[PDB]
């Protein structure tokens, strides 16, 4: 369970609470809190993960540069997607803030079921490419 894994562990665990949309969620949701505590989650997972790839560059079992090239692209994009999705996820939580601060009272009720499946789609996305990241780091910690 790497520094990388426990981190996102926490992120994705927070994200599950946002996903519920109880009253404390929605109240963290119309101010600043959710996206920004989700920002400081997204970020520490990126850092520790950066941190682990940084380690494995010492443990490589070797082949000649056409591959030592590809070794970038494979991982770094995969990494980056994982980033990109948890950064675009805060997009959706900030455009919520908005579509409610649009509402002028009236009612989030319709919206919190919109908000909810678009979230569950996006979170299903973060999950896939974290799996795929789990995957590259491994054959990258192995050649194989």
From Swiss-Prot:
<feature type="repeat" description="5">
    <location>
        <begin position="128"/>
        <end position="144"/>
    </location>
</feature>
<feature type="repeat" description="4">
    <location>
        <begin position="106"/>
        <end position="127"/>
    </location>
</feature>
<feature type="region of interest" description="LDL and other lipoprotein receptors binding">
    <location>
        <begin position="118"/>
        <end position="128"/>
    </location>
</feature>
<feature type="repeat" description="3">
    <location>
        <begin position="84"/>
        <end position="105"/>
    </location>
</feature>
<feature type="glycosylation site" description="N-linked (Glc) (glycation) lysine">
    <location>
        <position position="53"/>
    </location>
</feature>
<protein>
    <recommendedName>
        <fullName>Apolipoprotein E</fullName>
    </recommendedName>
</protein>
<comment type="function">
    <text>(Microbial infection) Through its interaction with HCV envelope glycoprotein E2, participates in the attachment of HCV to HSPGs and other receptors (LDLr, VLDLr, and SR-B1) on the cell surface and to the assembly, maturation and infectivity of HCV viral particles. This interaction is probably promoted via the up-regulation of cellular autophagy by the virus.</text>
</comment>
<feature type="modified residue" description="Methionine sulfoxide">
    <location>
        <position position="103"/>
    </location>
</feature>
<feature type="repeat" description="2">
    <location>
        <begin position="62"/>
        <end position="83"/>
    </location>
</feature>
<comment type="function">
    <text>APOE is an apolipoprotein, a protein associating with lipid particles, that mainly functions in lipoprotein-mediated lipid transport between organs via the plasma and interstitial fluids. APOE is a core component of plasma lipoproteins and is involved in their production, conversion and clearance. Apolipoproteins are amphipathic molecules that interact both with lipids of the lipoprotein particle core and the aqueous environment of the plasma.</text>
</comment>
<comment type="subunit">
    <text>(Microbial infection) Interacts with hepatitis C virus (HCV) envelope glycoprotein E2; this interaction is required for HCV infectivity and production.</text>
</comment>
<comment type="subunit">
    <text>Homotetramer. May interact with ABCA1; functionally associated with ABCA1 in the biogenesis of HDLs. May interact with APP/A4 amyloid-beta peptide; the interaction is extremely stable in vitro but its physiological significance is unclear. May interact with MAPT. May interact with MAP2. In the cerebrospinal fluid, interacts with secreted SORL1. Interacts with PMEL; this allows the loading of PMEL luminal fragment on ILVs to induce fibril nucleation.</text>
</comment>
<feature type="binding site">
    <location>
        <begin position="122"/>
        <end position="125"/>
    </location>
    <ligand>
        <name>heparin</name>
    </ligand>
</feature>
<feature type="modified residue" description="Phosphoserine; by FAM20C">
    <location>
        <position position="107"/>
    </location>
</feature>
<comment type="similarity">
    <text>Belongs to the apolipoprotein A1/A4/E family.</text>
</comment>
<feature type="repeat" description="1">
    <location>
        <begin position="40"/>
        <end position="61"/>
    </location>
</feature>
């Amino acid at each position: 369970g790497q520094r990388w894994e426990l981190a996102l562990g926490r992120f994705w665990d927070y994200l599950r609470w946002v996903q519920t949309l109880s009253e404390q969620v929605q109240e963290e949701l119309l101010s600043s809190q959710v996206t920004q505590e989700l920002r400081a989650l997204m970020d520490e997972t990126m850092k520790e993960l950066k941190a682990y790839k940084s380690e494995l560059e010492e443990q490589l079992t070797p082949v000649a540069e056409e591959t030592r090239a590809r070794l970038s692209k494979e991982l770094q994009a995969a990494q980056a997607r994982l980033g990109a999705d948890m950064e675009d996820v805060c997009g959706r939580l900030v455009q919520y803030r908005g579509e409610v601060q649009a509402m002028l009272g009236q009612s989030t009720e319709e919206l919190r079921v919109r908000l909810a499946s678009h979230l569950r789609k996006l979170r299903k996305r973060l999950l896939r490419d974290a799996d795929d990241l789990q995957k590259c780091l491994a054959v990258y910690q192995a050649g194989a």
